[PDB]
Each structure stands twice: as structure tokens, then as C-alpha cells.
Design an enzyme around this catalytic site. Structure first.
Site, PDB file in Angstrom:
ATOM      1  N   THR A  44       0.832  -1.203   0.000  1.00  0.00           N
ATOM      2  CA  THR A  44       0.000   0.000   0.000  1.00  0.00           C
ATOM      3  C   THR A  44       0.871   1.258   0.000  1.00  0.00           C
ATOM      4  O   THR A  44       0.701   2.176  -0.789  1.00  0.00           O
ATOM      5  CB  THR A  44      -0.879  -0.030   1.239  1.00  0.00           C
ATOM      6  N   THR A  45       1.849   1.265   0.923  1.00  0.00           N
ATOM      7  CA  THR A  45       2.740   2.412   1.043  1.00  0.00           C
ATOM      8  C   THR A  45       3.566   2.633  -0.210  1.00  0.00           C
ATOM      9  O   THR A  45       3.987   3.755  -0.459  1.00  0.00           O
ATOM     10  CB  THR A  45       3.628   2.197   2.303  1.00  0.00           C
ATOM     11  N   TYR A 107     -13.176  -3.563  -2.969  1.00  0.00           N
ATOM     12  CA  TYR A 107     -14.293  -3.053  -3.741  1.00  0.00           C
ATOM     13  C   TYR A 107     -15.422  -4.072  -3.912  1.00  0.00           C
ATOM     14  O   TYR A 107     -16.602  -3.755  -3.679  1.00  0.00           O
ATOM     15  CB  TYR A 107     -13.797  -2.480  -5.126  1.00  0.00           C
ATOM     16  N   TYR A 133      -3.233 -10.301   3.835  1.00  0.00           N
ATOM     17  CA  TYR A 133      -3.257  -8.892   4.266  1.00  0.00           C
ATOM     18  C   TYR A 133      -4.671  -8.440   4.425  1.00  0.00           C
ATOM     19  O   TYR A 133      -5.449  -8.406   3.448  1.00  0.00           O
ATOM     20  CB  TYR A 133      -2.406  -8.078   3.323  1.00  0.00           C
ATOM     21  N   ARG A 138      -9.681   0.013   3.911  1.00  0.00           N
ATOM     22  CA  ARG A 138      -9.390   0.236   2.518  1.00  0.00           C
ATOM     23  C   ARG A 138     -10.196  -0.622   1.519  1.00  0.00           C
ATOM     24  O   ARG A 138     -10.364  -0.207   0.404  1.00  0.00           O
ATOM     25  CB  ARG A 138      -7.949   0.002   2.235  1.00  0.00           C
ATOM     26  N   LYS A 161      -0.677 -10.155   7.699  1.00  0.00           N
ATOM     27  CA  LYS A 161      -0.486  -8.735   8.030  1.00  0.00           C
ATOM     28  C   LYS A 161      -1.868  -8.242   8.420  1.00  0.00           C
ATOM     29  O   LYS A 161      -2.754  -8.071   7.589  1.00  0.00           O
ATOM     30  CB  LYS A 161       0.096  -7.944   6.837  1.00  0.00           C
ATOM     31  N   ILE A 203       4.743  -4.975   9.703  1.00  0.00           N
ATOM     32  CA  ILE A 203       5.021  -4.456   8.418  1.00  0.00           C
ATOM     33  C   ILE A 203       4.635  -2.970   8.480  1.00  0.00           C
ATOM     34  O   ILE A 203       3.466  -2.648   8.670  1.00  0.00           O
ATOM     35  CB  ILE A 203       4.259  -5.195   7.254  1.00  0.00           C
TER      36      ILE A 203
END
Ligand code: K
Ligand code: K
Ligand code: K
Ligand code: K
Ligand code: K
Ligand code: K
Ligand code: K
Ligand code: K
EC number: 4.3.3.7
Lengths: 292, 292, 292, 292
Positions: A44-45, A107, A133, A138, A161, A203
Site C-alpha cells: 500500500t505504502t 471493492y 493482508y 481500505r 499482516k 510491516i
């Protein structure tokens, strides 16, 4: 390596939004020197959302080339279509990555059974270790402990994660999985608490700018020295919070620029430049951490 | 164009998961015969998440070809990277669609400034009318009324599909935009309420299987006949709810198959087949609506 | 005593809703024999909501009389009007209680400053130790760590019963208060996790029926033996959850009846008798705990 | 009786925190002159939480005496113990009030069956008309439409004050009850929307300081003049919001004092005096409404 301080590394960009190899080199060297355990490439980052699969693969390969065997690399490989996740995964087979970080579909809000089929199918088609994850804020879905339990029975699904920030998940998951399944925090502000409850590492976004302190905090935590670790966490807590004052990775990229670790703080739309008020907040958090 | 009952049409598939032309033709004919106002091709209910951009474009183009000028076609064109949304929109420039339905970026949780820049950039690269689409349960972000007002100043941003289910949004938005900005519900269960407050129609899941009833409801609403409209709404309310008993479009595909509208109820992973309990629930709702 | 397993005791009633002294005696004897640390008299579980101040005082005095010095008693003394909390507190001055459990005002939603003034005024007017009680799901407000920090500077504000179930609160509060401030869980399902993070005990519903196992779990936790404690917590977890299958204390009173600890499971309206499905669920949880 | 703009009147106090008769008279005269439809005496905005039942009754009786038949008076009669709600209601039997506003039990979080039994018992012990009041943000419980339907069958349960701010509730409830069951908003900011969907009026905070405007808005709504009503609503919207900038009734008391309607803005702890920043915010809202 899947324990300790693992950085969700920025994808540093020039003014045109293209990957800056010189900046990435500087970050990788920083992580090797600072004791970071592993690098998550295009999480993501790392702006997984706005790189296409070709650019995403390039960044992973560049990170592997630059790492040069000195630090393990984990690739982001998630997708919201199970076929696309399989496809992406195949691109990294025999690349040199040690594992994959695979997010719950976003989504489309699949059922638990849908998540189970998704991840089972991905794992089936690679020999690489998979790290699940979960980040409901999100994605719109929430991979629940019972499903994590079912998936941990798949040979190469090796950990999670867990980015809900809901600390009850640590022992809900631990009690359903084997002792060798890795539980990693994906929420820097609650990560020490997550390790204190039985988690194995983090993480981390914060690790992009406080790599040495994060590495020592996680070692102390692994050894049981939580009061010592908490001293460090207290100095880092404004950063853990204020790196989200505007959407990640807007603040952390600006921080990396301010410290000189990257040449520019450019991101891809729909991420926009940090606001003046955010610059002031982030700067103050950096100073609290002793970084400037 | 953009009033009345607009169907978010399913993308019917064969058993292999690829578009079924015979089924799509049957649906489009049905919507023409039923009085549906327009078709949204490859929105959420159309499985935008699991079609690649080529496949997505093929479905849009096939849908236009089959519509044969009898019913207007709006393309889903959303993406969570601004560049990708511009590329997708460009595929349809000069195609025959009458406008685009463009969802807020999902997963990356941009700021309101980011949403403004995203949609303003997309609008600048096309002449097609743009309908914003806000659905925070799926995206992790909420396009607020103030920002809708800001965007409504862009010439070809002409409406919104408001799928929060938060009916206060109708008059919040209406007070900030011009009288010709179109307010459409994205939430079937609240849509009649939404039109009662000032909205202009609905982009509907339910209209896939109750097209005639939806179009009659919406006509009655536009004419101010709310009590008559509400009788129709009450007959449809179990379907409005139970078409989400499992994740959309799992139930509505099953329902289409049960009604003889499509050949198979196949979907793409991570969407999975309807459960037995789900079949029984949706069956009961179809019976309540007088459709079975 | 303000550490270990502290029971939020039921107020056992006859068929008319009046306190049953014989049943209360049996419970108190049970707690003394089972190693419970203290008894909270007329907390939430004790139906503070539906006793008047006179009946509330009677129950506290009866509990003290029956305890006969063998186990410490803490009285519920909260109110949503600061004058009323002061008044109630005065009734227990020199009673023999060791401290008071004082809930954040409910219904009127005071600011943080309002909570600070409320509790500061209550503490000012007694010499008895005060334990703050935060339970936002019931009260509509949330006493935040910063305010707890301010209040812990008041000599006789000695700890908190933190019932959010949000485990990040443990170390947010710990870092603002002295080492002698007591942090107690008010959420049985997360209580072991709360102690593992630094909490000192639990004010427990589950303890009403599993007193010995709760007492041993909390001792093991205090000693650092979390894996051993977790074995016990695993056997108790269905009860921790299913004692809330219908509103507390409906399930726990039925459980106490089923075990023979009280003569009747009667409660005061608006609490109603347990449903048949709830009886089945609670019974199953009791059997999982090895209690029947 | 129960339509139009109903004020939830403040209980004005002297500096000692006791009712100020001269101020109450001034307010009641104001509401008579303004066209307010009815007065709710000792609702939430009237500080029901911090008056004892004697003081509460004195205020109701004084308000009726001062109204002198010019304006109907509804008493707040809620309690979270059924017995206590029956006792309070009984104080007003044969008093001259026209009905009672009875909130769902707070803090103890009864089941829907419990809510049904509570309100059915209260209704059975009086001949006065009962208005249910649902405000889950304050109480921790949510009286759902199905249960409202069940209660609406009780002869003297005649309406609801719906303070969720969830506008879907209007037609959910309306479909389950008779045409003469009264639907009233408890949320000023959404109330005009609420009336637009079918509701019959509002029990208002804002009407304490904008009585004439509120009554004119509501009259326009009842006549179907929504656009005219909305202009009034837009002038009042900052007050509708900013009268909750600090906890109700802190801002509305200050506003009353600033307008010369009451002698002092005193409240009872745990409500505290308005902050300087709050004064400035409410001042600006009053200016926007044309009241200052
Ligand atoms: K993307
Ligand atoms: K495999
Ligand atoms: K495994
Ligand atoms: K426009
Ligand atoms: K009470
Ligand atoms: K004192
Ligand atoms: K203290
Ligand atoms: K009735």
C-alpha cells in the site's frame, strides 16, 4: 525473513511519477545498514494502487537488484480478481523474492467463502510463501479469524499482516493456527501492543524513516522486554499517527524528502502534495522522534 | 439519458466466465420492452472488478451494438488511478455511449482534494457527460457534498449516483449544485425515499429482474404520486434487501437465471455461487414481488 | 483489594423483584470459597439501573453484613447528575466498603471537561477510593485517556474499569498515570488480553458462575503465565460471549439459577426473562466451561 | 397537540441551578407569540438528567401554570426502570398536560421485547397520550420500526419522536402504523427532510431561539411548500448544527441568554459553561439566522 521490523517501502518517484532508481538505492542501503528485517515492495505504502502490473514488476525487480542479496524482499501481489492475483504472482516466480503479501480483494466485498477460495487458488499456483493482508478500512471486507484458520492449513499460506488495529484479533487468530504461522501488525500505532499480545513483528510505514529504532523496538519486543520497547514506541507514537495525517504515503514520502533519503516527494494522482499544515505536523513528529 | 429507472446491468456469463452474447441480447431486449430509461454497462453489478479493461470494453461495445439505438448506454469508467481512469474513458470517446459512471477511487483513500483533482482531470480528457459515483462501503472513501459542489462546476460533470443510503445527502448536494445536476440513488432499498426528497431516479440492481415495476415506480415518483409508487416499493422491498443476502451480483445473477433471462448464473472469483440458503431467500423475495 | 478477579455480582431477586438475602448469602459464600478478590455490589450486572437509591443502599449493606469481613466490597455509586453521585457516595461513607465504582454520566453526554469536573467533585467529597468506569456502549460518552490522566492526579481516584473492549486504551492510559493506578478490564471477552498488555485485573460478569477459574486465570496472568491463563480463557470464552446473548444480566442470572446458586432468575423490567433459544446457548457455554 | 414546531424547552436556571420562574414565563410568552405548536417540558434539552423527580414535576407544573391554556404542554416522563417511569407518569395524571414524551430506557440496553413491555406497561397505567422517543446516541438502544408497529397498537401510544437522524425510518414506521400515528423529528438538522418524507413536525432544540422561523418552516412543509421551507431551513442550518457544538443544552442556553430570553445560562454538572470558542461559533450562527 517474516519476523521483526519489515518496511512497507515507498516507491520513490521523480517529478514525472516514474520510479527513481537513485532514491530507491539510497533507501535500500539505509534499510540494510539499519537492521530492517525485510522489505515489502509495492505494498500500500509503495502505491500498488497506481502502478500498472508492468511498472509494479519493474519496481520489485529493481528492488531485488539493488538489495543484491543483502536484505529479503517480499512483493505485493494482491488483486481483487482471483485470476489477476494468480497472473501477477506468476511474474515473480523464480525472481528472488522470498514471499508475497496478498491483500483481500477490495471493492467487490466477497464472502468469507469467496476469500477462502481466492487465497487457496493463489497459493495453489506458486511455491512462494504467502502472507495474507487484511485492511478493511481500505477494501470493504474483513478477513475473519475463522477463515484465516482455514487458510493457514494451506502449506504455503504462512502468515498475516493484520491491519484492523483491533488487537483482539491476535489471539483469536493464534488459537486457530499453528505455532509457526506468522502474525504481523499492519498498524504502526498499535504494533507494539500487537507484539506484546503474541505478534511476531510489523510491516511498518514508520520504519521508512525510523528504521533503526523500529528494528530495536521489535527485537526488544521479541525478547519480552516490553517496557524498554515502549520507551522507543513513545518517541515514535506521534509519527505512527501523523504519518496518516493525510493519506498514506503522502506524509511518509514528504518525510523521506525532508530527511534527504529520496530526491522528490512526488506521488501519483489521486494522491496529491502534502498541505502546509501537514508538513508542519509531520515535521513536529520527526523532531519528537529525534530524526531532525 | 439520466432520469427514471436505470439498470446496472449484470454481465451475463457462460460457464467459463466470459460474456454470453445471447443472454446479454435477451436482457437488453427485456429492458427495452420494460421501459427502463438507460443501461449502465460494467458498473459494480456488471462485475467491473473482475473484467480486464479489454474485456470491459468488449462488453460495453457489445451492449451498445445490441441496444441498437433503442436504449441509451452509460459505461462504467472508474479506476483508482487517475491515469487509468483517463485511459478507460478514452476507449469510449466517440463510441456511442451517452455518458460515464465513474466511481471514487477505491483502496487508496484519497483526500477530498484528491477526489476533486481525479474527477476534474478525467472530465478534462473527454466530452462525455460524467456521473460521479459514491459508494464508501466498497471504496473506503466518501465524496462529500461540498466536493460534489465543487465538481459540479466542471461543465461535463452532470450528476451523481449516491449509494451511501444516507438520505440527508440529497438536499445537501442539491443546495450546492445547479437545478440541472442529476441526483440518482445507488441504493435500491432507499431509492423511492431518495426520489421523494428531490432525486431524479435510481441506478438499480433490482431493475435487473423487476424492470417494469421499477420503471412504473419511478414514473409515479416523478409525477408526485408517492403513495402509488410506495405500493410498488413494498412489493419489491424484499428483493431490494435480499438481492444483497450474499454479495452483489451473486443473488441478482441467480434470480436472472431463475427467471429465464440468462443462460447461466456464473460469476468470476472471488464471487462464488449462491448458497442453498441464499437461493431459498431470493426465491421467496421473487414470489413476494409477483415475479415467480 | 483492586487487582485479580473482582465479581460484578448479580442482585438475586425473588419472584417479586425484591432482593433475596438467602441467595445473596449463597453467592457471597461461593466467592469467598473460590478465591474471588472483591465484590462489586450494584454495578451494571447488579441492576443499578432499576434499584432506587434506598434499595441500592440496602443491597450494599446486606452484602457487607453477609461478607462479614471475609471479602472486600466495592459499591456502585455512579450517577448522571454530579449532585446525585455525591449524595449517593455519602450514604456509604463509614459503611465498611473499600471503594466505589463510579460510571461516566449516561444519557446527557458531557464533554471531557464535564467528566473531569464530575469525577473531581465526587472524589473531593469522600475519603473512599474511586474507580472510574467507562462503558460508552451504555452511556453515550467515552472517557478518553487524556482525561483519565488528569483525574488520576486526584489523590483518591485510584483506577479505572475500562469496558470499551478497545485494547489500545491499556497503554494509552498507563503512560499518563502513576504505577500505582489500577487498570481493570470491564469486558470479559477481552480481559485476558487486557491483563497481558498491563492491566491488573478484571471486574467480571463471568466470575459470577466461574469464580475459581477466573481467580486462577487472573493470578496466572499477574505472574506472567499467559499461555497457562489462555487455556482457561479458551474454556471460558463461550461464556464470556454468550453471557451477553441477551442483555446482561438476563443470561448470568439464569446461569446462576441453573447451577443452584440463586433461588430465582427474576429481574426488573425493562429486563425480561431469558428466551428458550438463549437458555440453550447459555447452557452450552456452561457445559464448555465444565460447570454443568 | 402533536404537529408543527414543538419546542423542547430549556429549563432556565438561576445562578444556583434552580428553576428561574421569570425566565420560564418570558420563554413561554415568546412561544405563544411565535406560533409554537406545543412545549415539551423537561425533555432532554430541559435537563431531565439532572433534575430529581420532584424538581422535574415542579417545572412541568409551573410550565402548565404559566402556559395558562394558551399553548399545550407535553411532559418528559422517561425512565430506565419501568416502575419509575410509571411513577413519574402518575404524577401528571389529571394535571393538564396533553401527553407524555417517554424515552427508551437508557444504560441498561433492553431487548426489543423489553422495550415493548416497558412502554406497554407505562401506557396501561395512564390515560394520557404517549409519544415514544428514540435517541440511540444517548441511550445505547434503538427502538426499531417493527417494535414501534407493535406498540402503535396500544390505544394511547400515538406517536414517536425519531431522533436517529436516519431518514429511512420515516417510511419504515409509517408503513407499519395507522394513518393517525404521529411522526416527529428529533433531529433539527434533518427535520425538514423528515417532514418531506411524510413526518408531521419536529420536537426542536432550534425553536428555543428561532421559534417564529421554525413555526413558519413547519407550516410551509405541512402545506407542501418545500422550496419555501428550505430557504428558512438554510438560514437556520448553522444553528441546527452549532447548537450541538458543545453538549445540548449548553449552547442553546447561552443563545437564550444572549437573545435576552433568559436571565442566566446556568446548567447543572456534569454540563459545564460554554467555552469561549463555543460562544463565538454560536454567535456566528445566530447572526446567520438574522437573530442577532
Ligand atoms: K489500479
Ligand atoms: K502451492
Ligand atoms: K501453512
Ligand atoms: K456541470
Ligand atoms: K433508574
Ligand atoms: K477527598
Ligand atoms: K490518584
Ligand atoms: K395507538
Amino acid at each position: 525473513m517474516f519476523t521483526g521490523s519489515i518496511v512497507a517501502i515507498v516507491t520513490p518517484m521523480d517529478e514525472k511519477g516514474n520510479v527513481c532508481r537513485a532514491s530507491l538505492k539510497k533507501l535500500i542501503d539505509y534499510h540494510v545498514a539499519s537492521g530492517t528485517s525485510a522489505i515489502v515492495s509495492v505494498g500500500t505504502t509503495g502505491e500498488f494502487a497506481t502502478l500498472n502490473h508492468d511498472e509494479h514488476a519493474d519496481v520489485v525487480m529493481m528492488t531485488l537488484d539493488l538489495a543484491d542479496g543483502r536484505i529479503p524482499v517480499i512483493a505485493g501481489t494482491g488483486a481483487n480478481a482471483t485470476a489477476e492475483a494468480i497472473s501477477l504472482t506468476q511474474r515473480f516466480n523464480d525472481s528472488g523474492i522470498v514471499g508475497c503479501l496478498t491483500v483481500t480483494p477490495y471493492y467487490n466485498r466477497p464472502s468469507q467463502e469467496g476469500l477462502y477460495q481466492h487465497f487457496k487458488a493463489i497459493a495453489e499456483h506458486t511455491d512462494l510463501p504467502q502472507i495474507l493482508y487484511n485492511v478493511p478500512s481500505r477494501t470493504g471486507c474483513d478477513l475473519l479469524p475463522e477463515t484465516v484458520g482455514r487458510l493457514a492449513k494451506v502449506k504455503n499460506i504462512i502468515g498475516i499482516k493484520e491491519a484492523t488495529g483491533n488487537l483482539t484479533r491476535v489471539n483469536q487468530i493464534k488459537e486457530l493456527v499453528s505455532d509457526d504461522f506468522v502474525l504481523l501488525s499492519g498498524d504502526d500505532a498499535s504494533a507494539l501492543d500487537f507484539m506484546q499480545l503474541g505478534g511476531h513483528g510489523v510491516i511498518s510505514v514508520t520504519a521508512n524513516v525510523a528504521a533503526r529504532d523500529m528494528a530495536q523496538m521489535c527485537k526488544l519486543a521479541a525478547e519480552g522486554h516490553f517496557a524498554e520497547a515502549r520507551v522507543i514506541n513513545q518517541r515514535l507514537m506521534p509519527l505512527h499517527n501523523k504519518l496518516f495525517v493525510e493519506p498514506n504515503p503522502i506524509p511518509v514520502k514528504w518525510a523521506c524528502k525532508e530527511l534527504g533519503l529520496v530526491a522528490t516527494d512526488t506521488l501519483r494522482l489521486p494522491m496529491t502534495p502534502i498541505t502546509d499544515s501537514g508538513r508542519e505536523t509531520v515535521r513536529a513528529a520527526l523532531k519528537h522522534a529525534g530524526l531532525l
